[PDB]
Design a protein around this motif. Sequence first.
Motif, mmCIF file in Angstrom:
data_model
loop_
_atom_site.group_PDB
_atom_site.id
_atom_site.type_symbol
_atom_site.label_atom_id
_atom_site.label_comp_id
_atom_site.label_asym_id
_atom_site.label_seq_id
_atom_site.Cartn_x
_atom_site.Cartn_y
_atom_site.Cartn_z
ATOM 1 N N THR A 153 69.335 26.334 24.713
ATOM 2 C CA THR A 153 69.547 27.529 25.521
ATOM 3 C C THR A 153 70.955 28.075 25.322
ATOM 4 O OG1 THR A 153 68.038 26.529 27.123
ATOM 5 C CG2 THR A 153 69.243 28.500 27.813
ATOM 6 N N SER B 89 62.353 18.659 21.508
ATOM 7 C CA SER B 89 63.466 19.557 21.801
ATOM 8 C C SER B 89 64.240 19.903 20.536
ATOM 9 C CB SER B 89 64.388 18.925 22.841
ATOM 10 O OG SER B 89 63.740 18.840 24.097
ATOM 11 N N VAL C 194 74.043 10.849 22.887
ATOM 12 C CA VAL C 194 75.402 11.171 23.314
ATOM 13 C C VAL C 194 76.258 9.917 23.415
ATOM 14 C CG1 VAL C 194 74.956 11.022 25.797
ATOM 15 C CG2 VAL C 194 76.690 12.620 24.919
ATOM 16 N N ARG C 195 75.636 8.761 23.627
ATOM 17 C CA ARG C 195 76.379 7.527 23.842
ATOM 18 C C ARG C 195 76.879 6.903 22.547
ATOM 19 N NH1 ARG C 195 71.378 5.380 27.434
ATOM 20 N NH2 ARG C 195 70.456 5.782 25.371
ATOM 21 N N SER D 64 73.967 17.386 21.152
ATOM 22 C CA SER D 64 73.533 16.020 21.401
ATOM 23 C C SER D 64 72.206 16.058 22.145
ATOM 24 C CB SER D 64 74.575 15.251 22.208
ATOM 25 O OG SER D 64 74.146 13.924 22.454
ATOM 26 N N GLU D 65 71.159 15.551 21.503
ATOM 27 C CA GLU D 65 69.812 15.578 22.054
ATOM 28 C C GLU D 65 69.007 14.478 21.373
ATOM 29 O OE1 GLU D 65 67.061 15.632 24.090
ATOM 30 O OE2 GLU D 65 68.107 17.473 24.689
ATOM 31 N N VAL D 66 68.046 13.911 22.108
ATOM 32 C CA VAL D 66 67.307 12.738 21.642
ATOM 33 C C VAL D 66 65.801 12.967 21.705
ATOM 34 C CG1 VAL D 66 69.143 11.166 22.279
ATOM 35 C CG2 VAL D 66 67.382 11.703 23.925
ATOM 36 N N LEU E 170 74.391 9.004 32.945
ATOM 37 C CA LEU E 170 74.679 9.801 31.760
ATOM 38 C C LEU E 170 75.599 10.977 32.061
ATOM 39 C CD1 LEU E 170 71.270 9.798 29.840
ATOM 40 C CD2 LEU E 170 73.428 8.752 29.170
ATOM 41 N N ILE F 159 66.573 22.646 24.641
ATOM 42 C CA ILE F 159 65.945 23.537 23.672
ATOM 43 C C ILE F 159 66.944 24.594 23.226
ATOM 44 C CG2 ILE F 159 63.568 23.141 24.413
ATOM 45 C CD1 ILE F 159 63.707 25.477 26.196
ATOM 46 N N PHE G 279 73.230 17.141 25.865
ATOM 47 C CA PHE G 279 71.908 17.286 26.478
ATOM 48 C C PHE G 279 71.360 18.689 26.219
ATOM 49 C CE2 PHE G 279 74.861 14.841 29.137
ATOM 50 C CZ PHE G 279 74.382 13.557 28.928
ATOM 51 N N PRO H 156 70.521 14.853 32.800
ATOM 52 C CA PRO H 156 69.182 14.653 33.363
ATOM 53 C C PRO H 156 69.238 14.421 34.864
ATOM 54 C CG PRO H 156 69.398 13.431 31.328
ATOM 55 C CD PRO H 156 70.763 13.990 31.632
HETATM 56 N N1 LIG Z 1 71.131 9.675 25.826
HETATM 57 C C1 LIG Z 1 70.957 10.977 25.605
HETATM 58 N N2 LIG Z 1 71.718 11.636 24.659
HETATM 59 C C2 LIG Z 1 71.530 12.985 24.440
HETATM 60 N N3 LIG Z 1 70.584 13.680 25.163
HETATM 61 C C3 LIG Z 1 69.833 13.037 26.092
HETATM 62 C C4 LIG Z 1 70.004 11.681 26.333
HETATM 63 N N4 LIG Z 1 69.131 11.312 27.300
HETATM 64 C C5 LIG Z 1 68.419 12.404 27.674
HETATM 65 N N5 LIG Z 1 68.849 13.479 26.933
HETATM 66 C C6 LIG Z 1 68.376 14.875 26.972
HETATM 67 O O1 LIG Z 1 69.107 15.675 27.883
HETATM 68 C C7 LIG Z 1 68.313 16.778 28.284
HETATM 69 C C8 LIG Z 1 68.552 17.112 29.756
HETATM 70 S S1 LIG Z 1 67.417 18.361 30.411
HETATM 71 C C9 LIG Z 1 68.622 19.672 30.055
HETATM 72 C C10 LIG Z 1 68.146 20.571 28.913
HETATM 73 C C11 LIG Z 1 69.037 21.763 28.557
HETATM 74 N N6 LIG Z 1 70.084 21.952 29.556
HETATM 75 C C12 LIG Z 1 68.175 23.012 28.373
HETATM 76 O O2 LIG Z 1 68.632 24.143 28.551
HETATM 77 O O3 LIG Z 1 66.997 22.920 28.014
HETATM 78 C C13 LIG Z 1 66.871 16.388 27.998
HETATM 79 O O4 LIG Z 1 66.344 17.259 27.019
HETATM 80 C C14 LIG Z 1 66.935 14.983 27.428
HETATM 81 O O5 LIG Z 1 66.055 14.844 26.336
#
Ligand SMILES: Nc1ncnc2c1ncn2[C@@H]1O[C@H](CSCC[C@H](N)C(=O)O)[C@@H](O)[C@H]1O
Lengths: 291, 291, 180, 192
Positions: free
Chosen positions: A24, A48, A66-67, A42-44, A109, A22, A19, A88
């Motif tokens: 960080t 982002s 991620v899944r 892992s990001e979708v 998740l 951006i 997740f 999330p």
């Molecule tokens: N199935 C999935 N696999 C990977 N990422 C996912 C996901 N479902 C949602 N996300 C992502 O997980 C993130 C959680 S918000 C957390 C963002 C991160 N911690 C930061 O510093 O910005 C979101 O950007 C969302 O797009």
Amino acid sequence: LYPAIPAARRRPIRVLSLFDGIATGYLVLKELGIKVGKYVASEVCEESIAVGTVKHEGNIKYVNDVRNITKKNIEEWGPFDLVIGGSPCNDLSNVNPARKGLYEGTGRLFFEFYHLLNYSRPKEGDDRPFFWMFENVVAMKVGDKRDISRFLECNPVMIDAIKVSAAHRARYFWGNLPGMNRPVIASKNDKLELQDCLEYNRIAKLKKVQTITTASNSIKQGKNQLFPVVMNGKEDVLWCTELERIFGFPVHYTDVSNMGRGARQKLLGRSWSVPVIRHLFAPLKDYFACE
Amino acid sequence: LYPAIPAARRRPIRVLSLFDGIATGYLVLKELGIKVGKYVASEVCEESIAVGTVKHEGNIKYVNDVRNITKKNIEEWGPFDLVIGGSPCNDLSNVNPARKGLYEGTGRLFFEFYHLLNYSRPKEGDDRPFFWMFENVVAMKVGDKRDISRFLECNPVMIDAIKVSAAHRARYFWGNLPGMNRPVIASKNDKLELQDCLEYNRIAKLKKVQTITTASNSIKQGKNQLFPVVMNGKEDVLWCTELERIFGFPVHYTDVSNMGRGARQKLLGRSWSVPVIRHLFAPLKDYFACE
Amino acid sequence: FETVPVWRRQPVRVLSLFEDIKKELTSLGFLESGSDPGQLKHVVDVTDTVRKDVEEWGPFDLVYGATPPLGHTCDRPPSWYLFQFHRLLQYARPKPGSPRPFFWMFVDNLVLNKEDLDVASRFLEMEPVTIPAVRVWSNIPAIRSRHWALVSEEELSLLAPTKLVKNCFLPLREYFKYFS
Amino acid sequence: FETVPVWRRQPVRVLSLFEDIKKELTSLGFLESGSDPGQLKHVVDVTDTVRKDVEEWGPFDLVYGATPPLGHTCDRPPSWYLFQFHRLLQYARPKPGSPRPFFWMFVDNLVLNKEDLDVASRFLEMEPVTIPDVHGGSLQAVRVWSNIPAIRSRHWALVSEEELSLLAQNKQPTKLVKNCFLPLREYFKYFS
DNA sequence: GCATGTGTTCTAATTAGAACGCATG
DNA sequence: GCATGTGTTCTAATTAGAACGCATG
Ligand SMILES: Nc1ncnc2c1ncn2[C@@H]1O[C@H](CSCC[C@H](N)C(=O)O)[C@@H](O)[C@H]1O
Ligand SMILES: Nc1ncnc2c1ncn2[C@@H]1O[C@H](CSCC[C@H](N)C(=O)O)[C@@H](O)[C@H]1O
Ligand SMILES: [Mg+2]
Ligand SMILES: [Mg+2]
């Protein structure tokens, strides 16, 4: 604690970020002077990914959803020295009345992080260094904070961004990082009050702003919804570059992909406070190469 | 024509800029190394003024709508060593079939520049240095180009940004600046091909792009109307930061006032090409202080 | 601009743009009858006239500007007449040192929109006076000096030069030769 | 997991969760009719059980997971049973050097939907095997994930999901227990 | 004692995309 | 001998801003 590593036996860090948002985690680590060997994200969210790609020039290996990460994938892309994730909180935070708890909707998740953390843990009889950390909101049901702690076999320390940023942000932090419970102290380059984050010819009406969400309503402060800024005598909302300074991101960090005001706020409102992640990752300098 | 000044008799430059836009004149002057004593900008667009104040930290004195500037104002805010401006071309350019010539609509605002230029000229017998310059589009009715040349008592020098930009931009330049007719030549830092202006992981289809306008259709090249960029195998339009690099502006110059893609393109589309203006103002550093 | 003794009042030198006022001007006796070359220059279209032209046309004492009155058709925008008028005056005004009294006036037949009125006043550095009708901007002291009947905008609604118009030319006789 | 000689087969040490199967295990003959303590532990409200707890309960030979049968006994979300089962399973695995055969299995009385099914298979590293038990007709079906070889070795009667969807509501286990628990005393002691 | 929040939804304004236009190398 | 352009307009989605919500220091 973990055994100290001599300065010469240290090697660049290999991170699995779930997740990633951006990026960080990557940003903090390189601004921290740590040489990053590998950062698997892992990001979708397309926007982002766009940010982490452009701002970090392709050093991040994106791994969509991620899944779809297998036990084979963890051994292939491994080994990992660090596993960080923020799940999330659409269905966990108390700011949403229609939240579906930890076991339904988006809340489940969390278990993907738990699942893939154990795939990544060193096998018994290998005490090579290994660190992890998980973050979420404090405004969650008691049963969820309880069950999350049971799966991670750990209890969270809360850090509020308000001690190092100009914004209220209270978040829980499970993990095994060195000195997580250590007292939080500010830096000489933390923009501590809102006036430090605004641009020329803008006046801050408060010293610190309430918690910033994705919606544009958390920019108007309190129960009289006053605009936090005055410019040329007129009231006005925060600017995207100002939201960035509040969070500790480098200015123009989200100036990507033709994103407007709403889009940048949706990405910033979900992220981590940079100086707080800096707090947590700081003791990792003594376990990995530095260049 | 005008005699050189010794280095020590040079004073900082005092410029009156009409239709200032996003303060391209001030930008090129500061980027040339010229000491800017006074920069009086007539501009009436809110977010344009927002850019100028924020990016230049209040060094620009904004003097709203040009038609409220009086003979008294010119002699109070004066004297001026440089008077620059480009009038709105929405009623002059050929790209609008509903143009109203320079005698109706917004084209009449040219005469404001003519009328305020005479006020600013040094009175007969004052051999002090004085420079002026006026820009507009080449795609205007021949009758308009004739009349403008009559009032300014000068003939324009067309310069196309194509030789220093990555974009077609052909415009006329009335003025009395040193060496305007001279051949234009590129510099090392000039980004000549579109691929030099794009971000990481983006591929450009062309080396040069068609003339940028305010509308988002000017960005799709040719009769085919195709996205000038490919990234991740998919076609895509340019980004605001890329549009900035095309025009020679500093990247993130229009990340102001919570402006989205459309807003920023409207401001950049009507702007001047920075390296063309640099070519024009370059001989001015031999008449004014440098710091 | 002080008054001039009668024995040194030379004859006028007029530049008339967009209207031939030679007939209207001679009537009040400012122009010697018959083939007087340096008494009045008339140009109907000016879009190609350079400053070097009006300088070569001898110095001028009066510059007159007017628009087409109730013309069935005007091939030019209404603002065009004022803009070209202001353009030439700057060419025709003499050196900063004043050898003699230099006057100018512009005359509108109520053909300029209110948007064109406010730009007319800004360029001619004065608000117009109305002679009951026609509005005039002018340098002449004695048409922005004295008596004039005050009429309102409801009079311009219903309106939509032997004696009345010439009443705004008489004060020029105190400055130049009266030919009788 | 090679088979064990008959003179070396111990009694099972079963961990049972969410559902008590002692009546079934004793019946097929894996447990003593009378045990001073017992060879089978059973818990239901697992929300507050730690790794230190299941280790203090001795080593285990089998860990059995189940969802409640189709009824109105759904006080917790359906996914909650699998996630907690996976959590305890990792607590109950022995040291990497395996002293003995360690089996696990998780059964579903058709209470998990599609989204809950695919997440179950990802965590258990196996996609499920379903049993018809319909020798009479379409009569009384349960999906099982299992370590047990013969559960995922011999293939028996198949059934289309278009027919498996309609039968889910049909409720509004002599054969089932016999079908897959059976090939476990090729590894443990048989009591009768 | 009462103000606060890593969000959703509804509804209202505002904004994207392209058709439109034709003088002119 | 066809293609291009410091814009406008109209239409169709895409927003923006606030109501909604209440456990809890
Ligand atoms: N199935 C999935 N696999 C990977 N990422 C996912 C996901 N479902 C949602 N996300 C992502 O997980 C993130 C959680 S918000 C957390 C963002 C991160 N911690 C930061 O510093 O910005 C979101 O950007 C969302 O797009
Ligand atoms: N009445 C007026 N008074 C002053 N400026 C005006 C005006 N009407 C329009 N303008 C401004 O004149 C500008 C002309 S566009 C030219 C922009 C400038 N040359 C640049 O480099 O960016 C526009 O920004 C418009 O907002
Ligand atoms: Mg801890
Ligand atoms: Mg020239």
